[PDB]
């Protein structure tokens, strides 16, 4: 079959910027390249088909171009409604294949995480289900690393990671890591620390 690769997983931009997303096909497709948009709620809809044609309701600020094995999508000036994921799909041979997707971010000034830590609650101790939770709020950019510590020594087991999406008012991300512990192992160690940079 034909494999389709998009250059970048994520893109940063600001309202009014002109942005470009480009797909590239392993093998030549005689045009027949389409661009879809998926909103954060989860609704997909077509934007451009056959490399240059707009759908019925797609806003005019989208355009496409290309040939051979190189194609690209251009947005003239970002609006807030244009924050989504964008996919490319070939239809020159069966099976039809899809691009990896490119998510769009709003650009803003840098920030630093507000790290916090908590001890296991009394009910957890009563039932033995120890769980230390670490919060990291309102930071930029989205990429971050988290590494836990027990009695100074590192730990790499029983860790659950979860990230929010980009905030729609302050435009920073967030994270939370939970370290599940049994009662026996929680009480056999001295201290804990949540290191993340």
């Amino acid at each position: 079959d034909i494999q389709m690769t998009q250059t970048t997983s994520s893109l940063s931009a600001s309202l009014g910027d002109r942005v470009t997303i480009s797909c590239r096909a392993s093998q030549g497709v005689n045009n027949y390249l389409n661009w879809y948009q998926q909103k954060p709620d989860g609704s997909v809809k077509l934007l451009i088909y056959y490399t240059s044609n707009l759908h019925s309701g797609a806003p005019s600020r989208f355009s496409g171009s290309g040939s051979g094995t190189d194609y690209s999508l251009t947005i003239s000036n970002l609006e807030q409604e244009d924050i989504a994921t964008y996919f490319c799909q070939q239809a020159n041979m069966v099976p039809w294949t899809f691009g990896g997707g490119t998510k769009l971010e709003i650009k803003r000034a840098d920030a630093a995480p507000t790290v916090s830590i908590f001890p296991p609650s009394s009910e957890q101790l009563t039932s033995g289900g120890a769980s230390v939770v670490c919060f990291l709020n309102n930071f930029y950019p989205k990429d971050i690393n988290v590494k836990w510590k027990i009695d100074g020594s590192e730990r790499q087991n029983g860790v659950l990671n979860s990230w929010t999406d980009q905030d729609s008012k302050d435009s920073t991300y967030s994270m939370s890591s939970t370290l599940t512990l049994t009662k026996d192992e929680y009480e056999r160690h001295n201290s804990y620390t949540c290191e993340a940079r």
Partner: peptide
């Protein structure tokens, strides 16, 4: 696709 075909259609293997 539109008919009459003014451009070639995708492939069948």
């Amino acid at each position: 696709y539109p008919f009459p075909t003014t451009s070639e259609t995708p492939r069948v293997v």
